Amino acid sequence: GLVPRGSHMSHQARVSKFDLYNSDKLDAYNQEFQVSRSNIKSINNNGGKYNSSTIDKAIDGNLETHWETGKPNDANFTNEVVVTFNEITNIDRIVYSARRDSARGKGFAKEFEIYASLKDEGDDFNLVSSGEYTESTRDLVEIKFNPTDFKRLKFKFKKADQNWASAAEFMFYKEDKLNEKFNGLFTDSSMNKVSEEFNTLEKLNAFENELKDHPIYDLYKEGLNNARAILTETSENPTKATLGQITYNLNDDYNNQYRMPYKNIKAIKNNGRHYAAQNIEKAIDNDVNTYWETGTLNSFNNEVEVEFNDLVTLDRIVYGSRQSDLKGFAEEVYIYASRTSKGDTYKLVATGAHEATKGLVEAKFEPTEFKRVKFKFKKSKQNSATLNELMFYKP
Ligand SMILES: CC(=O)N[C@@H]1[C@@H](O)[C@@H](O)[C@@H](CO)O[C@@H]1O
Ligand SMILES: [Ca+2]
Ligand SMILES: [Ca+2]
């Protein structure tokens, strides 16, 4: 499942991770939208090449071969690459990666400019788009701008990570209008309000139907379901949860019926890093003897966030502290639910309190749907935060 990237229709490019690449849909996608590698006539660049990392390697269809410049950016020199197409070609996107060898990410175009020419020769280039990407240097990114005709496309490494501009691949794509519609599903990057054109179930369901023959329809489903969850959301109704020591976690048969499978955990994270090697993944390793401990400390609240693969209805969260001393036992807890896979869509489900104790405690509340859960350490014994296990039980 992709998530909407936000609309782009200024002259600042939208740059996002090209997650499409990992999918079984890629080939069908490329068939329809990619500019064939066979339409790329030639490539040159102004900085030469390092060793055998020749410029042809930037457009050979292999993410495991790269060009690297022979001359790094400096205060006086900016690396650029010029691609010539067989014929004038309409393009709205570049998909780009830096080198992916042992120095992966080195030379990533952290800032770039894109220029068009309709000629084969001459310096008549006009600025099409400028952009940046600050998230990572290791990513395959989609750079999306206004659809433009190119005989030659010039790509300038305005800032290259560690100056030594590199490219595993430059790939080119034609406009995908339905994809852009999907990119405009939400009003902003928080993805917690559906855009006006989809802002009813009637409109959203019609849109889903409209996407059904699209090559990456299956990847759109997650975002569509997120929108639907927002459209159908009810007012938050937090209660006080009842907290008590429990031992039913020992009961395998019970767990089979009532405990959410650990395999349903897509991801875990927290806001406070961790102390020593008491990392977060051991709050969910199914071992009461291993525990997470925060790197930060209350004042600030510690919070843990668990993402699920499948939405699940829970009525209980079971937790315990580090068993040695009980340091960082959540004495007071806020439980937040989101019904979306991403976005700023959490609502408060329940508040609860219990004295620190050995063993496991359930926090029981009203049955609630969770696609993701936030566990907030309101008050914690000794202003630390610790989890030996975090478990989720159904009504
Ligand atoms: C493997 C590795 O890091 N190779 C790089 C090489 O590609 C080039 O950037 C060079 C510049 O002095 O620095 C390193 O040797
Ligand atoms: Ca390559
Ligand atoms: Ca554990």
User: After which residues does a break in the chain occur, C–N more than 2.5 Å?
Assistant: 9, 299
The atom number, within ligand 1, closest to the CA of 162 reads 9
Confirm whether residue 203 is marked as ligand binding. Answer: no
> Half-sphere exposure of 323 toward its Cβ, with a 13 Å CA cutoff?
13
Burial (CB count <10 Å: 0-12, 13-18, 19+), residue 388: buried
* Torsion sign, CA atoms 385, 388, 394, 395: negative
> Which three-class secondary structure string do you get for 345-387?
CCEEEEEEECCCCCCEEEEEEEEEEEEEEEEEEEEEHHHCCEE
- Residue ranges matching CATH 2.60.120.260 in the chain: 15-168, 242-392
Helix orientation angle between 217-231 and 201-210, rounded to the nearest 10 degrees: 180
In the chain, DSSP finds a helix count (H) and a strand count (E) of 5, 19
Distance 54 CA to ligand 2 centre (A): 10
**Tokens read off for 35:** 């500019």
**Dist. CA 297–CA 380, nearest whole Å:** 9
- Helix H or strand E segment including 331: strand 330-338
Among the bound ligands, the one closest to the CA of 47? 1
- Displacement of CA 206 from its chain's centroid (Å): 26
**Dist. CA 389–CA 395, nearest whole Å:** 20
- For β-strands 390-393 and 360-380, DSSP reports them as unpaired
Confirm whether residue 389 is marked as ligand binding. Answer: yes
Reduced to 3 states (helix: H, G, I; strand: E, B; else coil), residue 300 is: coil
Reduced to 3 states (helix: H, G, I; strand: E, B; else coil), residue 149 is: strand
- Displacement of CA 76 from its chain's centroid (Å): 36
**183, 6 contact by CB (below 8 A):** yes
Q: What is the DSSP letter of 261?
A: P
**Dist. CA 282–CA 292, nearest whole Å:** 6
**363, 350 contact by CB (below 8 A):** yes
**Dist. CA 174–CA 89, nearest whole Å:** 9
Confirm whether residue 65 is marked as ligand binding. Answer: yes
Looking at domain 242-392, its CATH architecture is: Sandwich (2.60)
Reduced to 3 states (helix: H, G, I; strand: E, B; else coil), residue 392 is: strand
**Dist. CA 181–CA 269, nearest whole Å:** 31
Cβ neighbors of 269 (< 8 A, separation 6 or more) are: 280, 304, 305
The atom number, within ligand 1, closest to the CA of 103 reads 3
**Technique behind the model:** X-ray
Ligand 1 contact via 103 beta carbon (within 6 Å): yes
**Dist. CA 193–CA 111, nearest whole Å:** 30
What single-letter amino acid sits at 86? N
> Half-sphere exposure of 171 toward its Cβ, with a 13 Å CA cutoff?
20
Among the bound ligands, the one closest to the CA of 106? 1
Ligand 1 contact via 198 beta carbon (within 6 Å): no
- Helix H or strand E segment including 257: helix 252-258
Confirm whether residue 111 is marked as ligand binding. Answer: no
Distance 304 CA to ligand 3 centre (A): 14
φ, ψ of residue 204 in degrees (nearest 5): -70, -45
| Closest alpha carbon to 214 in 188, 246, 183 | 183
* Torsion sign, CA atoms 101, 107, 113, 116: negative
φ, ψ of residue 47 in degrees (nearest 5): -115, 10
- Displacement of CA 317 from its chain's centroid (Å): 26
**Dist. CA 381–CA 145, nearest whole Å:** 52
| Closest alpha carbon to 69 in 84, 61, 58, 59 | 58
Resolution of this entry, Å = 2.0
> Domain spanning 15-168: which CATH class is it, in words?
mainly beta
Give DSSP secondary structure letters for 177-223. HHHHHHHTSBSSTT--SB-GGG-SHHHHHHHHHHTTTSTTHHHHHHH
Give DSSP secondary structure letters for 34-103. BPPGGGEEEEEESS--STT--GGGGGSS-TT--EE-SS--BTTB--EEEEEEEEEEEEEEEEEE---STT
The atom number, within ligand 1, closest to the CA of 106 reads 9
Cβ neighbors of 226 (< 8 A, separation 6 or more) are: 3, 191, 340, 341, 342, 343, 345
